[PDB]
Amino acid sequence: EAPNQALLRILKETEFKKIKVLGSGAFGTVYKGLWIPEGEKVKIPVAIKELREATSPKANKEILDEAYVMASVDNPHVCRLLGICLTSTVQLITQLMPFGCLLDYVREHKDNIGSQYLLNWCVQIAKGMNYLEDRRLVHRDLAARNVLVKTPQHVKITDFGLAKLLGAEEKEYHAEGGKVPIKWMALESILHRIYTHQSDVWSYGVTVWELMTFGSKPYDGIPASEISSILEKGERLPQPPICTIDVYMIMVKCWMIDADSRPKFRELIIEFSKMARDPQRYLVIQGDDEEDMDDVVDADEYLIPQ
Ligand SMILES: CO[C@H]1CCN(c2nccc(Nc3cc4c(cn3)nc([C@@H](C)O)n4[C@@H](C)C(F)(F)F)n2)C[C@H]1F
């Protein structure tokens, strides 16, 4: 197989400064911060993810496995790891996405999200996803919560906690136990623990549904145990009121039993692009930062020779 010549950057704790907490999960604390490299005269808005507090060797392998995947990606619609900090607790340093996750964004801005925006997000998620397919990467956790907003017009795929690299003549990934998101999972993933790029396509369909419903919970109320029995019977997520048969037919195609019958991410870019050219024909919607900001540079503009 092809050697992975990606560069993992080790950053000094002194190079960056924590401002406030963005999220305090059971896994850790994500901090809003600023990164001032060596003597570069730049301030890079960052998101610093530290592994809870305690140093357990079991979870350190998980954060470094996430660092491996995140350092091996480079696409405008995928979040790249800026570096790692080897302190008492391992810290992942990533680009600050000022508008947070897409799921919370669609819920918080329901009344100001237009058809042009929803369809553009779909194209963008399909572009980043097709890139991961080119990189032989299976996400295994694509959802609106794992799509971050850089600007309302620019979103990127993130959270490589479950991501796996295939390569050569490996077409599918076989999993173990662990907590897995059942409501975003393809049927072969629930029944056989088989993950492919086409299983990611199913998850893409559910992500699109979340967006088109403005952040509604898929199969709301239904326990994860019943999902498998529901999908096997032929039941799928409802048509969002704003969706024309055109958009819904795309979501439906992602949820077909035969994985190879589902659309490819390169076809989803094409389909949604045609739709983004005349967004009102496809979506029916009624009525459709405290420091010296002189040297602030976004991570997408801060590059080091590759
Ligand atoms: C479980 O860890 C996740 C957390 C989100 N990760 C991430 N990846 C790339 C960039 C990035 N930046 C990033 C993440 C941000 C953010 C600004 N920038 N603002 C928020 C809140 C206020 O809405 N979040 C969320 C997702 C949280 F706090 F939970 F992280 N964050 C990917 C993994 F590290």
UniProtKB/Swiss-Prot annotation:
The modification Phosphotyrosine is found at residues 173, 302. One of its GO terms (molecular function) is protein tyrosine kinase activator activity. The modification N6-(2-hydroxyisobutyryl)lysine is found at residue 49. Keywords: ATP-binding, Cell membrane, Developmental protein, Disease variant, Disulfide bond, Endoplasmic reticulum, Endosome, Glycoprotein, Golgi apparatus, Host cell receptor for virus entry, Host-virus interaction, Hydroxylation, Isopeptide bond, Kinase, Lipoprotein, Membrane, Methylation, Nucleotide-binding, Nucleus, Palmitate, Phosphoprotein, Proto-oncogene, Receptor, Repeat, Secreted, Signal, Transferase, Transmembrane, Transmembrane helix, Tyrosine-protein kinase, Ubl conjugation. Changing residue 278 to A: Strongly reduced phosphorylation. Changing residue 38 to K: Found in a lung cancer sample. Changing residue 8 to A: Abolishes phosphorylation. Changing residue 23 to D: Found in a lung cancer sample. Changing residue 49 to A/M: Abolishes kinase activity. Changing residue 137 to V: Found in a lung cancer sample; more sensitive to gefitinib than wild-type. Changing residue 23 to C: Found in a lung cancer sample. There is a cross-link at residues 20, 41, 58, 61, 171, 233, 264, 274 (Glycyl lysine isopeptide (Lys-Gly) (interchain with G-Cter in ubiquitin)). This is Epidermal growth factor receptor. The lineage of its organism: Eukaryota, Metazoa, Chordata, Craniata, Vertebrata. The chain holds residues 697 to 1020 of 1210 of the full protein.
